[PDB]
Structure formats: structure tokens, C-alpha cells
Design an enzyme around this catalytic site. Structure first.
Site, short mmCIF file in Angstrom:
data_model
loop_
_atom_site.label_atom_id
_atom_site.label_comp_id
_atom_site.label_asym_id
_atom_site.label_seq_id
_atom_site.Cartn_x
_atom_site.Cartn_y
_atom_site.Cartn_z
N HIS A 269 35.54 10.87 -11.46
CA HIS A 269 35.33 11.68 -10.22
C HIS A 269 36.55 12.52 -9.82
O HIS A 269 36.41 13.33 -8.88
CB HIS A 269 34.86 10.80 -9.07
CG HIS A 269 35.85 9.85 -8.49
ND1 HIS A 269 35.77 8.50 -8.77
CD2 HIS A 269 36.80 9.98 -7.54
CE1 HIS A 269 36.70 7.85 -8.07
NE2 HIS A 269 37.35 8.75 -7.33
N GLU B 292 32.98 5.77 -15.78
CA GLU B 292 33.88 6.26 -14.70
C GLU B 292 35.34 6.35 -15.16
O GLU B 292 36.22 6.55 -14.29
CB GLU B 292 33.73 5.41 -13.44
CG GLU B 292 34.26 6.09 -12.17
CD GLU B 292 33.69 7.46 -11.84
OE1 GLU B 292 32.59 7.81 -12.35
OE2 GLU B 292 34.40 8.23 -11.12
N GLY C 39 42.32 6.75 -1.09
CA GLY C 39 43.72 6.86 -1.53
C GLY C 39 44.09 5.86 -2.61
O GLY C 39 45.16 6.04 -3.21
N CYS D 290 42.10 5.19 -5.38
CA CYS D 290 41.43 5.50 -6.68
C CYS D 290 42.47 5.83 -7.74
O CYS D 290 43.45 6.59 -7.47
CB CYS D 290 40.30 6.53 -6.58
SG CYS D 290 38.91 5.85 -5.61
#
Length: 182
Positions: free
Chosen positions: A41, A72, A146, A148
Site C-alpha cells: 500500500h 502485502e 505511522g 506501517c
């Protein structure tokens, strides 16, 4: 404060950079040579900022399992003039559950941040932001925007990168040794 925090600090001080894309600032784990990982992402493009320096992306691959399900994890090769310490021998070979993990974050917003998250479950399937995702680890900590890209470690193993949360639990994508055979 103890041997979990000691291992986490050793990884953060040598094997992390601050990555900035158009989607934000992320903790980025360097694994070996010029190869690093980041949550998919982050939407890595042809150019990324690494510790506020404009850096060409030589390759970027958004990993999916053999059922064509999102994992991911994006693997990025950076046009950087310096190699990372090779940490591939700290990566697990198989999906597993863990005790006593630490989540470590380094950004402009959260520098030198370490969180003892405790027990980590092999959760498996997660609908992450609407996207079916496999190989998810879960910990019972109220993780926040914050975090990730944050690195999940135990003593002696680098097991995942933080990719989301639901306000009460946090979720990481597994790192496996087989992702980084070359």
C-alpha cells in the site's frame, strides 16, 4: 530494556531506512545487497526518497501467493551506493506462531520507537482495507497510523512487517527466507 529489545535495536540501527512515497513515510527494512521491503500500500513508483535522498527504483515486485492472493509485501531494489548487512539468516523458513515479539518503528513522527506486542498468532486470512490478504500475523496491541513498515522481531528472528490494525489488534505480513533466495 532486555534481550528482545536488544535484537530489535541491532536490526533497526543497521537494517532500516526511512522511505517516502506519495502515500507517506514508512519504516523500510533492508534485507541484503540493495534489496529492501515495504508494505504494498506504499505504492512504490520509479523514484522513492530514502532518508530524504531521491533514489531510482531498479525493480519493485508486489508479492502474491500461488492462489494469486495479495501478501502485502513489496520487494524493492534501490539504486543506492551502499549495501545492507545481509540478515537473510534471521528470516523464518515456514509460517509459524511466536512468543514475546517487539514491533520497532523509525520515522520523522516516531523515531527510536519500540513496542513489546507479546504473543503473535499465525492468523492467516485477513480482509485488509477491502483486499483479501494471506500469511497475516496478529498481535493484541492497539497500533496506530505511522507504524506501517515497522519491523516485527523475536530474539533471533525477523518475522514480519506491520501492515495494519483495527484499533485493538495489529497485523503484520510474514517475511519468509524463500522470498529472498537469489
Amino acid at each position: 530494556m532486555g534481550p528482545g529489545f536488544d535484537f530489535a535495536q541491532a536490526i533497526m540501527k543497521k537494517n532500516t531506512v526511512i522511505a517516502r512515497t506519495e502515500k507517506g513515510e514508512f519504516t523500510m527494512l533492508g534485507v541484503y545487497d540493495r534489496v529492501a521491503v515495504i508494505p504494498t500500500h506504499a505504492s512504490v513508483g520509479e523514484i522513492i526518497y530514502i532518508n530524504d535522498v531521491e533514489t531510482r527504483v531498479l525493480d519493485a515486485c508486489a508479492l502474491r501467493d500461488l492462489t494469486d492472493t495479495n501478501l502485502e509485501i513489496t520487494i524493492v531494489k534501490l539504486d543506492r551506493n551502499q549495501k545492507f548487512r545481509d540478515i537473510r539468516h534471521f528470516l523464518p523458513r515456514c509460517e509459524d506462531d511466536y512468543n514475546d515479539a517487539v514491533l520497532s518503528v523509525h520515522t520523522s513522527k516516531f523515531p527510536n520507537m519500540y513496542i513489546p506486542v507479546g504473543q503473535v498468532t499465525n492468523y492467516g486470512f485477513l480482509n485488509l482495507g477491502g483486499t483479501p490478504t494471506h500469511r497475516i500475523l496478529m498481535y493484541n496491541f492497539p497500533t496506530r497510523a505511522g507504524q506501517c513498515g515497522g519491523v516485527v522481531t523475536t530474539t533471533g528472528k525477523v518475522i514480519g512487517i506491520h501492515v495494519g490494525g483495527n484499533g485493538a489488534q495489529g497485523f503484520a505480513a510474514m517475511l519468509l527466507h524463500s522470498y529472498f533466495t537469489d
